[PDB]
């Protein structure tokens with residue numbers, strides 16, 4: 001298992017990164033410090049996570065301590081939905097860079113294919129609970145992303161939560177300057193994404209799997225919901241390898257030639273989650289895990305389902 005994958009810009013992206021959604025600012029600095037100490041070189045960030053300053057503190061300290069060099073780190077962030085207007089994109093990227101204390105990102109993603117009304121709120125709702133869209137479109141937002149590459153703010157650009165038709169829209173743009181390098185999508189044994197992965201990989205786009213542990217800390221979880229980490233079938237596969245269920249869930253996407261970004265703020269778990277380069281899932285294991293697909297999505301906000309660019313009405 002090679003630890004990095006080649007992107008379309010010639011850069012290599014570590015296949016294991018640290019997720020930071022729901023990592024509170026009072027804990028995320030320590031999490032990132034520990035992650036860097038134990039070998040993580042990829043950090044997945046976003047403005048909407050409200051913790052980029054604290055991620056930035058940790059990176060800066062480890063650079064200053066001579067633990068890592070900037071060129072060895074792969075820092076990803078994402079353009080939030082309220083900044084899709086062409087005139088807002090650069091400032092959103094620069095705010096992220098300032099918070100992270102960086103002079104470039106390795107990868108910058110369109111976080112979701114939908115634009116929301118610009119303003120202070122991340123989730124502007126009307127009086128009846130519907131998200132308030134903006135009149136922006138995917139291609140104009142992509143053009144603004146391309147400018148960030150041209151100006152040296154970001155080394156690569158990509159997309160997240162795009163369906164295959166939305167990806168195709170960008171690929172087919174007349175006068176396209178940069179192809180998306182990455183599509184970051186939810187992916188785990190209950191949402192295996194076979195068709196979208198096949199699509200993306202056939203078009204030379206690297207897929208990153210988010211919520212690989214099933215995001216048990218997601219704020220809308222219901223007790224009746226399926227739980228990957230507690231699935232006794234996955235426990236049994238883990239036991240056979242003398243690994244944890246999380247380690248199995250992280251290794252699974254790696255063997256599908258995906259990048260994977262498990263989140264933790266717990267130091268023991270951050271270290272555990274990295275110890276996935278010392279075993280292999282068998283062909284039967286892989287087949288069995290894929291068989292658990294239920295098309296069950298843990299990230300898809302009800303209030304957004306009437307947006308014109310809502311991604312999940314399409315089959316894939």
Ligand SMILES: NC(=O)c1ccc[n+]([C@@H]2O[C@H](COP(=O)([O-])OP(=O)(O)OC[C@H]3O[C@@H](n4cnc5c(N)ncnc54)[C@H](OP(=O)(O)O)[C@@H]3O)[C@@H](O)[C@H]2O)c1
Nearest residue numbers: 019020021210211212213214215217246262263264265266
């Ligand atoms: N692009 C997007 O739209 C998008 C959407 C969702 C997620 N993401 C990215 O993907 C990352 C990962 O997804 P996620 O945060 O939704 O969830 P996840 O990584 O599937 O699960 C994180 C949860 O699992 C727990 N956990 C971690 N390691 C564990 C272990 N070894 N044993 C038991 N429990 C463990 C964590 O607890 P503790 O932290 O308390 O240890 C946390 O509650 C995010 O943080 C974000 O960076 C991107």
Ligand SMILES: O=C(O)Cc1nn(Cc2nc3cc(C(F)(F)F)ccc3s2)c(=O)c2ccccc12
Nearest residue numbers: 021048049112113114299300301304307310311
């Ligand atoms: O965003 C993250 O990284 C994690 C994430 N996910 N979700 C669920 C979402 N579902 C969406 C669906 C659309 C849609 F495109 F479908 F309209 C657009 C935007 C969203 S946010 C959230 O509600 C959220 C809130 C704060 C911080 C991060 C998140």
